[PDB]
PDB file of all heavy atoms in Angstrom:
ATOM      1  N   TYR A  10      34.527 152.460  98.025  1.00 41.67           N
ATOM      2  CA  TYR A  10      34.551 152.576  96.696  1.00 41.67           C
ATOM      3  C   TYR A  10      34.947 153.993  96.346  1.00 41.67           C
ATOM      4  O   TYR A  10      36.012 154.304  95.738  1.00 41.67           O
ATOM      5  CB  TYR A  10      33.255 152.399  95.919  1.00 41.67           C
ATOM      6  CG  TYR A  10      33.404 152.385  94.375  1.00 41.67           C
ATOM      7  CD1 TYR A  10      33.767 151.286  93.697  1.00 41.67           C
ATOM      8  CD2 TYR A  10      33.037 153.568  93.737  1.00 41.67           C
ATOM      9  CE1 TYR A  10      33.830 151.391  92.275  1.00 41.67           C
ATOM     10  CE2 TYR A  10      33.093 153.619  92.333  1.00 41.67           C
ATOM     11  CZ  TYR A  10      33.484 152.540  91.675  1.00 41.67           C
ATOM     12  OH  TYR A  10      33.569 152.601  90.311  1.00 41.67           O
ATOM     13  N   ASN A  79      34.862 135.792  84.327  1.00 38.79           N
ATOM     14  CA  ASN A  79      34.710 136.650  85.454  1.00 38.79           C
ATOM     15  C   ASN A  79      34.779 135.801  86.732  1.00 38.79           C
ATOM     16  O   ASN A  79      35.116 136.226  87.808  1.00 38.79           O
ATOM     17  CB  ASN A  79      33.527 137.455  85.315  1.00 38.79           C
ATOM     18  CG  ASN A  79      33.859 138.876  84.924  1.00 38.79           C
ATOM     19  OD1 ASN A  79      34.766 139.507  85.405  1.00 38.79           O
ATOM     20  ND2 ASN A  79      33.010 139.306  84.042  1.00 38.79           N
ATOM     21  N   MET A  82      38.178 135.255  87.512  1.00 39.16           N
ATOM     22  CA  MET A  82      38.918 136.562  87.962  1.00 39.16           C
ATOM     23  C   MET A  82      38.758 136.581  89.581  1.00 39.16           C
ATOM     24  O   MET A  82      39.753 136.774  90.248  1.00 39.16           O
ATOM     25  CB  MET A  82      38.232 137.687  87.321  1.00 39.16           C
ATOM     26  CG  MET A  82      38.867 139.110  87.813  1.00 39.16           C
ATOM     27  SD  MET A  82      40.500 139.281  87.284  1.00 39.16           S
ATOM     28  CE  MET A  82      40.278 139.881  85.622  1.00 39.16           C
ATOM     29  N   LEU A  83      37.508 136.473  89.972  1.00 41.42           N
ATOM     30  CA  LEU A  83      37.299 136.693  91.459  1.00 41.42           C
ATOM     31  C   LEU A  83      37.848 135.513  92.253  1.00 41.42           C
ATOM     32  O   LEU A  83      38.283 135.712  93.401  1.00 41.42           O
ATOM     33  CB  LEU A  83      35.845 136.879  91.685  1.00 41.42           C
ATOM     34  CG  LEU A  83      35.241 137.869  90.684  1.00 41.42           C
ATOM     35  CD1 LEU A  83      33.637 137.899  90.960  1.00 41.42           C
ATOM     36  CD2 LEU A  83      35.555 139.305  91.103  1.00 41.42           C
ATOM     37  N   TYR A  98      45.432 141.349  89.975  1.00 47.45           N
ATOM     38  CA  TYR A  98      45.509 140.305  88.964  1.00 47.45           C
ATOM     39  C   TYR A  98      44.446 140.547  87.679  1.00 47.45           C
ATOM     40  O   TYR A  98      43.365 140.848  87.925  1.00 47.45           O
ATOM     41  CB  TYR A  98      44.902 139.046  89.612  1.00 47.45           C
ATOM     42  CG  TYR A  98      44.703 137.895  88.683  1.00 47.45           C
ATOM     43  CD1 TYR A  98      45.823 137.024  88.338  1.00 47.45           C
ATOM     44  CD2 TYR A  98      43.446 137.481  88.252  1.00 47.45           C
ATOM     45  CE1 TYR A  98      45.660 136.027  87.623  1.00 47.45           C
ATOM     46  CE2 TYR A  98      43.312 136.414  87.411  1.00 47.45           C
ATOM     47  CZ  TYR A  98      44.337 135.595  87.108  1.00 47.45           C
ATOM     48  OH  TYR A  98      44.397 134.573  86.335  1.00 47.45           O
ATOM     49  N   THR A  99      45.110 140.653  86.605  1.00 47.02           N
ATOM     50  CA  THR A  99      44.519 140.941  85.336  1.00 47.02           C
ATOM     51  C   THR A  99      44.785 139.706  84.319  1.00 47.02           C
ATOM     52  O   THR A  99      46.008 139.401  84.150  1.00 47.02           O
ATOM     53  CB  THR A  99      44.731 142.305  84.648  1.00 47.02           C
ATOM     54  OG1 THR A  99      46.203 142.327  84.407  1.00 47.02           O
ATOM     55  CG2 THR A  99      44.310 143.462  85.572  1.00 47.02           C
ATOM     56  N   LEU A 119      45.608 152.478  85.968  1.00 44.85           N
ATOM     57  CA  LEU A 119      44.940 153.756  85.816  1.00 44.85           C
ATOM     58  C   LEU A 119      45.737 154.778  86.514  1.00 44.85           C
ATOM     59  O   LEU A 119      46.052 154.720  87.727  1.00 44.85           O
ATOM     60  CB  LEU A 119      43.411 153.704  86.276  1.00 44.85           C
ATOM     61  CG  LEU A 119      43.132 153.051  87.636  1.00 44.85           C
ATOM     62  CD1 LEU A 119      43.069 154.261  88.756  1.00 44.85           C
ATOM     63  CD2 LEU A 119      41.788 152.507  87.692  1.00 44.85           C
TER      64      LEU A 119
ATOM     65  N   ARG B  31      27.589 149.940  90.239  1.00  6.22           N
ATOM     66  CA  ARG B  31      28.557 151.083  90.142  1.00  6.22           C
ATOM     67  C   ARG B  31      29.016 151.407  88.653  1.00  6.22           C
ATOM     68  O   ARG B  31      29.888 150.864  88.162  1.00  6.22           O
ATOM     69  CB  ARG B  31      29.767 150.808  90.919  1.00  6.22           C
ATOM     70  CG  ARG B  31      29.665 150.932  92.393  1.00  6.22           C
ATOM     71  CD  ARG B  31      29.553 152.334  92.728  1.00  6.22           C
ATOM     72  NE  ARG B  31      29.144 152.588  94.148  1.00  6.22           N
ATOM     73  CZ  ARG B  31      29.134 153.796  94.734  1.00  6.22           C
ATOM     74  NH1 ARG B  31      29.369 154.911  94.075  1.00  6.22           N
ATOM     75  NH2 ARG B  31      28.661 153.912  96.058  1.00  6.22           N
ATOM     76  N   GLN B  33      30.748 152.145  85.622  1.00 10.87           N
ATOM     77  CA  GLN B  33      31.973 152.630  84.985  1.00 10.87           C
ATOM     78  C   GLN B  33      31.820 152.652  83.531  1.00 10.87           C
ATOM     79  O   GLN B  33      31.148 151.911  82.951  1.00 10.87           O
ATOM     80  CB  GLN B  33      33.065 151.798  85.580  1.00 10.87           C
ATOM     81  CG  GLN B  33      33.370 151.821  87.082  1.00 10.87           C
ATOM     82  CD  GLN B  33      33.145 150.493  87.799  1.00 10.87           C
ATOM     83  OE1 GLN B  33      32.678 149.433  87.074  1.00 10.87           O
ATOM     84  NE2 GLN B  33      33.190 150.569  89.009  1.00 10.87           N
ATOM     85  N   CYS B  34      32.859 153.485  82.858  1.00 11.39           N
ATOM     86  CA  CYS B  34      32.824 153.556  81.515  1.00 11.39           C
ATOM     87  C   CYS B  34      34.113 153.981  80.924  1.00 11.39           C
ATOM     88  O   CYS B  34      34.749 154.883  81.570  1.00 11.39           O
ATOM     89  CB  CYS B  34      31.671 154.540  81.017  1.00 11.39           C
ATOM     90  SG  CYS B  34      31.563 156.107  81.818  1.00 11.39           S
ATOM     91  N   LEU B  60      33.602 155.678  87.768  1.00  4.43           N
ATOM     92  CA  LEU B  60      34.819 156.363  87.200  1.00  4.43           C
ATOM     93  C   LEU B  60      34.607 156.587  85.776  1.00  4.43           C
ATOM     94  O   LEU B  60      33.907 155.741  85.088  1.00  4.43           O
ATOM     95  CB  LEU B  60      36.005 155.516  87.542  1.00  4.43           C
ATOM     96  CG  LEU B  60      36.208 154.036  86.985  1.00  4.43           C
ATOM     97  CD1 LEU B  60      37.134 154.082  85.626  1.00  4.43           C
ATOM     98  CD2 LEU B  60      36.974 153.150  87.919  1.00  4.43           C
ATOM     99  N   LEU B  62      36.906 156.918  82.166  1.00  3.16           N
ATOM    100  CA  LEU B  62      38.211 156.601  81.716  1.00  3.16           C
ATOM    101  C   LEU B  62      38.247 157.200  80.195  1.00  3.16           C
ATOM    102  O   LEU B  62      37.527 156.720  79.431  1.00  3.16           O
ATOM    103  CB  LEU B  62      38.551 155.197  81.612  1.00  3.16           C
ATOM    104  CG  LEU B  62      39.896 154.593  81.615  1.00  3.16           C
ATOM    105  CD1 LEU B  62      40.021 153.374  82.388  1.00  3.16           C
ATOM    106  CD2 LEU B  62      40.292 154.282  80.190  1.00  3.16           C
ATOM    107  N   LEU B 114      39.855 147.180  76.334  1.00  2.00           N
ATOM    108  CA  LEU B 114      38.720 146.534  76.782  1.00  2.00           C
ATOM    109  C   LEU B 114      39.102 145.436  77.811  1.00  2.00           C
ATOM    110  O   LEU B 114      38.635 145.423  78.891  1.00  2.00           O
ATOM    111  CB  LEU B 114      37.979 145.781  75.657  1.00  2.00           C
ATOM    112  CG  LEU B 114      37.325 146.727  74.688  1.00  2.00           C
ATOM    113  CD1 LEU B 114      36.618 145.981  73.527  1.00  2.00           C
ATOM    114  CD2 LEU B 114      36.282 147.624  75.358  1.00  2.00           C
ATOM    115  N   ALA B 117      42.311 147.311  80.732  1.00  2.00           N
ATOM    116  CA  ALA B 117      42.302 148.513  81.472  1.00  2.00           C
ATOM    117  C   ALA B 117      41.891 148.439  82.834  1.00  2.00           C
ATOM    118  O   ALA B 117      41.126 147.580  83.269  1.00  2.00           O
ATOM    119  CB  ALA B 117      41.345 149.484  80.731  1.00  2.00           C
ATOM    120  N   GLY B 118      42.485 149.329  83.718  1.00  2.00           N
ATOM    121  CA  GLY B 118      42.009 149.331  85.068  1.00  2.00           C
ATOM    122  C   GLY B 118      42.656 148.251  85.995  1.00  2.00           C
ATOM    123  O   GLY B 118      43.152 147.284  85.474  1.00  2.00           O
ATOM    124  N   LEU B 119      42.540 148.474  87.225  1.00  2.00           N
ATOM    125  CA  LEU B 119      43.146 147.467  88.163  1.00  2.00           C
ATOM    126  C   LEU B 119      42.088 147.130  89.264  1.00  2.00           C
ATOM    127  O   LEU B 119      41.484 147.991  89.897  1.00  2.00           O
ATOM    128  CB  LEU B 119      44.477 148.110  88.831  1.00  2.00           C
ATOM    129  CG  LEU B 119      44.491 149.344  89.549  1.00  2.00           C
ATOM    130  CD1 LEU B 119      44.157 149.432  91.010  1.00  2.00           C
ATOM    131  CD2 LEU B 119      45.985 149.854  89.337  1.00  2.00           C
ATOM    132  N   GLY B 120      41.870 145.785  89.429  1.00  2.00           N
ATOM    133  CA  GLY B 120      40.996 145.348  90.498  1.00  2.00           C
ATOM    134  C   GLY B 120      39.568 145.497  90.156  1.00  2.00           C
ATOM    135  O   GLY B 120      39.124 145.028  89.059  1.00  2.00           O
ATOM    136  N   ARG B 121      38.736 146.083  91.050  1.00  2.00           N
ATOM    137  CA  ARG B 121      37.257 146.309  90.741  1.00  2.00           C
ATOM    138  C   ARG B 121      37.120 147.772  90.095  1.00  2.00           C
ATOM    139  O   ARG B 121      36.130 148.095  89.850  1.00  2.00           O
ATOM    140  CB  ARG B 121      36.506 146.373  92.055  1.00  2.00           C
ATOM    141  CG  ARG B 121      36.400 144.952  92.580  1.00  2.00           C
ATOM    142  CD  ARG B 121      35.216 144.887  93.643  1.00  2.00           C
ATOM    143  NE  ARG B 121      35.093 143.580  94.228  1.00  2.00           N
ATOM    144  CZ  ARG B 121      34.374 142.590  93.693  1.00  2.00           C
ATOM    145  NH1 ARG B 121      33.854 142.785  92.644  1.00  2.00           N
ATOM    146  NH2 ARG B 121      34.236 141.407  94.275  1.00  2.00           N
ATOM    147  N   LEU B 122      38.187 148.542  89.769  1.00  2.00           N
ATOM    148  CA  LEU B 122      38.158 149.694  89.069  1.00  2.00           C
ATOM    149  C   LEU B 122      38.426 149.367  87.533  1.00  2.00           C
ATOM    150  O   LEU B 122      39.264 149.999  86.939  1.00  2.00           O
ATOM    151  CB  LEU B 122      39.120 150.641  89.624  1.00  2.00           C
ATOM    152  CG  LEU B 122      38.973 151.244  90.974  1.00  2.00           C
ATOM    153  CD1 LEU B 122      39.836 152.437  91.195  1.00  2.00           C
ATOM    154  CD2 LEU B 122      37.467 151.486  91.260  1.00  2.00           C
ATOM    155  N   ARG B 123      37.514 148.640  87.013  1.00  2.00           N
ATOM    156  CA  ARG B 123      37.632 148.299  85.580  1.00  2.00           C
ATOM    157  C   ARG B 123      36.406 148.956  84.872  1.00  2.00           C
ATOM    158  O   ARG B 123      35.337 149.174  85.472  1.00  2.00           O
ATOM    159  CB  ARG B 123      37.508 146.833  85.477  1.00  2.00           C
ATOM    160  CG  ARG B 123      38.839 146.136  85.438  1.00  2.00           C
ATOM    161  CD  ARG B 123      38.774 144.776  84.846  1.00  2.00           C
ATOM    162  NE  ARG B 123      38.124 143.856  85.814  1.00  2.00           N
ATOM    163  CZ  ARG B 123      36.839 143.319  85.719  1.00  2.00           C
ATOM    164  NH1 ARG B 123      36.203 143.660  84.727  1.00  2.00           N
ATOM    165  NH2 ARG B 123      36.361 142.554  86.608  1.00  2.00           N
ATOM    166  N   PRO B 124      36.479 149.204  83.586  1.00  2.00           N
ATOM    167  CA  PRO B 124      35.373 149.844  82.761  1.00  2.00           C
ATOM    168  C   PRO B 124      34.299 148.816  82.655  1.00  2.00           C
ATOM    169  O   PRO B 124      34.477 147.646  82.109  1.00  2.00           O
ATOM    170  CB  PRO B 124      36.015 150.168  81.494  1.00  2.00           C
ATOM    171  CG  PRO B 124      37.182 149.346  81.380  1.00  2.00           C
ATOM    172  CD  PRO B 124      37.661 149.207  82.835  1.00  2.00           C
ATOM    173  N   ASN B 125      33.073 149.111  83.199  1.00  2.00           N
ATOM    174  CA  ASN B 125      31.913 148.282  83.050  1.00  2.00           C
ATOM    175  C   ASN B 125      31.302 148.368  81.511  1.00  2.00           C
ATOM    176  O   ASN B 125      31.018 147.425  80.963  1.00  2.00           O
ATOM    177  CB  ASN B 125      30.884 148.700  83.869  1.00  2.00           C
ATOM    178  CG  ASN B 125      30.446 147.538  84.883  1.00  2.00           C
ATOM    179  OD1 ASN B 125      30.507 146.430  84.473  1.00  2.00           O
ATOM    180  ND2 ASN B 125      29.776 147.900  86.086  1.00  2.00           N
ATOM    181  N   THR B 126      31.201 149.576  81.034  1.00  2.00           N
ATOM    182  CA  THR B 126      30.669 149.919  79.787  1.00  2.00           C
ATOM    183  C   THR B 126      31.592 150.646  78.852  1.00  2.00           C
ATOM    184  O   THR B 126      32.659 151.174  79.404  1.00  2.00           O
ATOM    185  CB  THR B 126      29.279 150.672  79.835  1.00  2.00           C
ATOM    186  OG1 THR B 126      29.603 152.120  80.019  1.00  2.00           O
ATOM    187  CG2 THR B 126      28.532 150.219  81.043  1.00  2.00           C
ATOM    188  N   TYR B 158      30.094 143.846  77.788  1.00  2.00           N
ATOM    189  CA  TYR B 158      30.093 145.196  78.110  1.00  2.00           C
ATOM    190  C   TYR B 158      28.723 145.807  77.649  1.00  2.00           C
ATOM    191  O   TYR B 158      27.968 145.317  76.865  1.00  2.00           O
ATOM    192  CB  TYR B 158      31.183 145.958  77.273  1.00  2.00           C
ATOM    193  CG  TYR B 158      32.569 145.988  77.985  1.00  2.00           C
ATOM    194  CD1 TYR B 158      33.090 144.831  78.427  1.00  2.00           C
ATOM    195  CD2 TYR B 158      33.213 146.986  78.036  1.00  2.00           C
ATOM    196  CE1 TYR B 158      34.349 144.733  78.992  1.00  2.00           C
ATOM    197  CE2 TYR B 158      34.559 147.108  78.587  1.00  2.00           C
ATOM    198  CZ  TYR B 158      34.994 145.835  78.983  1.00  2.00           C
ATOM    199  OH  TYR B 158      36.337 145.710  79.595  1.00  2.00           O
TER     200      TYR B 158
END
Side-chain angles (χ1 to χ4, degrees):
Chain A
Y10 187 86
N79 260 317
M82 178 68 80
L83 311 168
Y98 176 80
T99 59
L119 52 90
Chain B
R31 286 292 170 172
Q33 293 110 4
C34 50
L60 67 95
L62 201 146
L114 291 179
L119 52 90
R121 291 196 180 276
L122 292 198
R123 269 195 287 108
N125 235 340
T126 79
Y158 278 44

